[PDB]
Design a protein around this ligand. Structure first.
Ligand SMILES: Nc1ncnc2c1ncn2[C@@H]1O[C@H](COP(=O)(O)O)[C@@H](O)[C@H]1O
Ligand SMILES: Nc1ncnc2c1ncn2[C@@H]1O[C@H](COP(=O)(O)O)[C@@H](O)[C@H]1O
Ligand SMILES: [Mg+2]
Ligand SMILES: [Mg+2]
Ligand SMILES: [Mg+2]
Ligand SMILES: [Mg+2]
Ligand SMILES: [Mg+2]
Ligand SMILES: [Mg+2]
Lengths: 583, 582
């Protein structure tokens, strides 16, 4: 059986078999973990690496096959772009090895005035990321390596207008574009059309949301051309979820559809977006995205619409929409009168024509397009950057919210368990954290790029809690109390029972230490009965300054102490081998 | 079969059969709803009136029979004292009828200077409740009648020192003593001993908690005398709950035990208290109270101990402990060194001797004891007041937290649905509520004494929400918005889905009304698809001022609009008949 769906350059069954066989060849054991089919003609599936819990993707589509091909395609997309590893430091060995990201990557050493080395970027890119000329080189060290001595790692992208290779720092790519504009496919142009369409989806989505645009409805006689989608919608409506199907082309300019679901049970809406040169493919994607990974009982996590236009335009609201679509939407979307008339648009053709048709729209926007091609995993994948259209985070984040900002503290923080510094050093580090302006809520593991696993204290450790630990090690019991209370107020819910119990104990002991007229020995039996001897022992050891870093095991520079991180590195090595062999 | 337990003047099976037969004779159909036996020698049971959801009690004891006799006894205690009705207005007919509470009640009309009429209370009681002489008569109108014209309803109690009848206003009783010191029993003295012991329990409990007293442990060789209790405690400890068994006699003065449970899973404690002249009976009650209505998975609702002395002593903390025992306990309770030595105390004997022994302790405290006797339901019951010992709430509450404080607004508020006042009258009522200083969080149904039932908007209506409704009826859409947001912030969780939906709709419309550059008709179709046509219609009708009191049905003066309240009155009429006949 061979099923050819609109817009794909191969049959579903062929894609599936091919992708499955290649994953296996590369040494990946991928399992399908759960399947959903919540309404007619809407499927989703979750797939994951049996040997690495951090690596998974999700599929979506109008049939079970289409969803599986989608999951597997996304798997190749994320593998090819190293995206599963993007939020992690990959250790000292990988950092100093032949190549960190790709064999054709280029390292640009830091300059003495700490300017951005000349061979990176190009003029338009410099003007777009750094209109102030305030970028330094040392801010652009990639999270994965953390290797300041080796310098700024740049990845090669082909500038489409003149076919020139341009090196864009991993740091800029990782922070500003994340997973937007990546793609994999049966062919080069199928993949590229999907990636370019994704750029349109998110860019136009952001305009629609941020500008509180009222969109025009897709007339019923147009929807009737796509009965599989009409069935899905009718079912949703029968199940108590009103659906609004909108043309998001903004007057026929962009190949974008918007579909909005209401949940009357809680007064909320959920706006989904999709793009493709073919109107029906775009419409379908939008609906299948809506329900991805959601049954009809999982539609309860969204937000009511609002009249507050400023809050809807806030870039953080657009970021939230990217992360989980639970951002704010203006009531103006659902106005009777649309700000653009409906257009029954069509940009469809062969995958070759579609690529040229979409590039013509970027050319007309006067927006340069940069494409990196990847074929080292035996499937075509790409990553497309369009500065000023495909960005997910604003360029100011390179200064304000850079994911490699805490690299320079990694070695120090990982050395704390078993450290034997002078008290003042521990207290000084508290001040350094404050002066460097880290949010107390930041997860240390995210700040340092650690796949800690779930069964130790690093998993849940936030800056605030670290400050508690440093206060204890440093002998400042008043600061210890402040940050121990903070810790419990904002984390007790996610601690294991053992760790929560330790913290109740420790807090009780710290409160007692502030009771000048009370004798600790009078309470000891009661403390032992409430908290257990072990916790009373550990907590007292923390208060003496002897073992303040409770539940934090020592961590080496290749993260051997974290089984989860080891599983991540083993997954990476599979990719490293593939890269070495392809280049 | 006949089972006699320590301290009771009749066999469990005799009490059970007797109490069951009498309830049936009086017209009450009582069912046993749920039974628990969470550890050995600890039982509890919940019983309720099949025809009135608001009437139920709970039993506890060391055996199933003992727990059933306890439930039924408590049933007679609460029926005899009218306590099931204590938080409700009983309507116009009852208010104006031959008698509201008892045939031997006395009504004292209000005076011209609004002093407290002379025949009420006695000199000591006046000095205790009103040391500054600031009590007025009009503040002592009983919640049940609300009948200011008829005056202050006083109930007769017998002062024990000289056997004189003294009339204590229902209002003072209801606000300050609640259910503390009531009792029923197989005999007059068995009941009275239980009631006096309860006064000791709660008075000593409050001292122990409020003063952060470290109590002494009951030595193991004493506990061994009561193996049924020891088995219960060992089981609890094996199940992961450390138990502290303390002597709470404060140096042998009072017949009180304290038992504390720790829940290490939570870091919390739960202190229980119990009293009786027999040390073993007191100990057992304390443990059986601990687990009443709780399985081993229901020990998760308590609070950690604290070092904050002031917060523990706060009277609101002691009130909380009375209401659900979830108040704060000082860590000092669990200190190694006790503030009193253990005393292996014993005040036991016959119920007659026990009554005299306990009265001797009150005589020594120089605390007068007042006792009302009730036998109109065919079972002896009593209610005992010991001013300065049995009080649950402080006398200042007669001024600051009086449960009849909102009676004068009842007629007005109940008339609001379907009312057709001028806008300004609605807004004026908002100001009146503010100026009278009612908390926005107060439930209107509690303020007015309404058994609303759970299926209408009166059930969940708080002052803040009433202000939203008045703002709408009065045409003030800015105030309407403020209080509509307050309403959802603090009540949406307990609204029915239909009511919550109505409030999301209304709030959306009130926000839209503040948007000067937006046209409402542009959003209508979206509003109908989100909220339904009915809610859009009801919310707009509220915003026009035409039907602002959404989900509040009109209420007549006999509360016919509330089925639940009708079921309450029918239960009360069964008691009225019994009273008249006795
Ligand atoms: N039938 C297919 N054959 C090959 N690749 C696919 C197919 N469907 C989706 N993909 C790729 O899988 C990823 C996720 O697909 P989607 O879930 O449709 O956004 C993207 O890289 C797609 O371009
Ligand atoms: N056999 C009995 N057992 C327990 N309580 C009884 C009995 N006969 C009457 N009572 C009364 O039952 C009510 C509640 O009992 P308790 O649950 O022990 O506090 C109190 O008013 C007791 O005085
Ligand atoms: Mg996807
Ligand atoms: Mg994608
Ligand atoms: Mg519209
Ligand atoms: Mg009870
Ligand atoms: Mg009682
Ligand atoms: Mg003690």
């Amino acid at each position: 059986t061979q099923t050819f769906i609109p817009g794909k350059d191969a049959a579903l069954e062929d894609s599936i078999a091919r992708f499955q066989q290649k994953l296996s060849d590369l040494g990946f054991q991928i399992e399908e973990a759960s399947w959903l089919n919540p309404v007619p003609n809407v499927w989703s599936v979750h797939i994951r690496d049996k040997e690495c819990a951090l690596c998974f993707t999700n599929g979506k589509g109008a049939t079970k096959k289409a969803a599986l091909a989608s999951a597997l395609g996304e798997y190749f997309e994320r593998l090819s772009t190293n995206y599963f590893f993007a939020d992690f430091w990959l250790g000292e060995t990988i950092a100093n090895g032949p190549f960190v990201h790709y064999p054709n990557e280029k390292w640009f050493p830091l300059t003495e005035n700490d300017d951005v080395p000349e061979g990176l970027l190009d003029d338009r890119l410099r003007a777009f990321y750094d209109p102030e000329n305030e970028l330094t080189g040392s801010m652009l060290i990639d999270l994965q390596s953390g290797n300041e001595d080796r310098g700024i790692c740049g990845l090669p992208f082909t500038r489409q207008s003149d076919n020139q290779t341009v090196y864009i720092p991993m740091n800029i790519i990782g922070n500003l574009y994340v997973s937007n504009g990546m793609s994999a496919g049966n062919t080069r142009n199928e993949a590229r059309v999907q990636g370019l369409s994704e750029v349109f989806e998110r860019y136009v989505k952001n305009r629609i949301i941020a500008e509180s645009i009222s969109l025009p409805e897709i007339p019923a006689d147009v929807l009737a051309r796509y009965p599989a989608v009409v069935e899905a919608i009718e079912t949703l409506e029968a199940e108590g979820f009103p659906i609004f199907a909108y043309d998001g082309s903004l007057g026929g300019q962009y190949p974008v559809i918007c579909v909005v679901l209401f949940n009357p049970a809680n007064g909320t809406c959920f706006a989904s977006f999709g793009a493709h040169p073919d109107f029906g493919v775009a419409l379908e994607r939008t609906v299948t995205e809506l329900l991805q990974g959601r049954g009809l009982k999982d539609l309860d996590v969204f937000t009511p619409p609002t009249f507050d236009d400023e809050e809807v335009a806030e870039h953080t609201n657009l970021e939230t929409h990217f992360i989980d679509s639970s951002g704010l939407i203006s009531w103006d979307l659902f106005k009777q009168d649309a700000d653009y008339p409906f257009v029954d648009w069509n940009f469809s053709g062969t995958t070759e024509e579609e690529f040229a048709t979409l590039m013509a729209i970027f050319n007309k926007e006067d927006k340069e397009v940069y494409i990196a091609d990847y074929e080292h995993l035996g499937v075509y994948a790409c990553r497309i950057i369009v500065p000023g259209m495909s960005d997910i985070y604003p360029a100011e984040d390179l200064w304000l919210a850079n994911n490699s900002m805490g690299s320079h503290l990694r070695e120090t923080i990982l050395s704390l368990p078993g450290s034997e510094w002078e008290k003042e050093d521990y207290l000084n580090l508290i001040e350094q954290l404050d002066e460097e302006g880290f949010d107390d809520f930041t997860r240390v593991r995210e700040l340092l790029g650690l796949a800690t696993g779930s069964d130790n204290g690093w998993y849940t450790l936030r800056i605030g809690e670290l400050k508690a630990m440093l206060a204890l090690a440093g002998g400042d019991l008043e600061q210890a109390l402040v940050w121990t209370e903070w810790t419990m107020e904002f984390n007790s819910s996610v601690f294991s029972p053992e760790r929560a119990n330790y913290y109740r104990c420790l807090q009780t002991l710290l409160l007692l230490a502030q009771e000048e007229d009370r004798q600790p020995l009078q309470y000891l039996n009661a403390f032992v009965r409430m908290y257990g001897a072990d916790a009373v022992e550990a907590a007292s050891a923390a208060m003496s300054g002897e073992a303040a870093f409770y539940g934090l095991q020592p961590v080496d520079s290749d993260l051997h102490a974290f089984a989860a991180h080891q599983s991540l590195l083993k997954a990476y090595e599979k990719l490293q081998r593939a890269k070495a062999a392809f280049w």
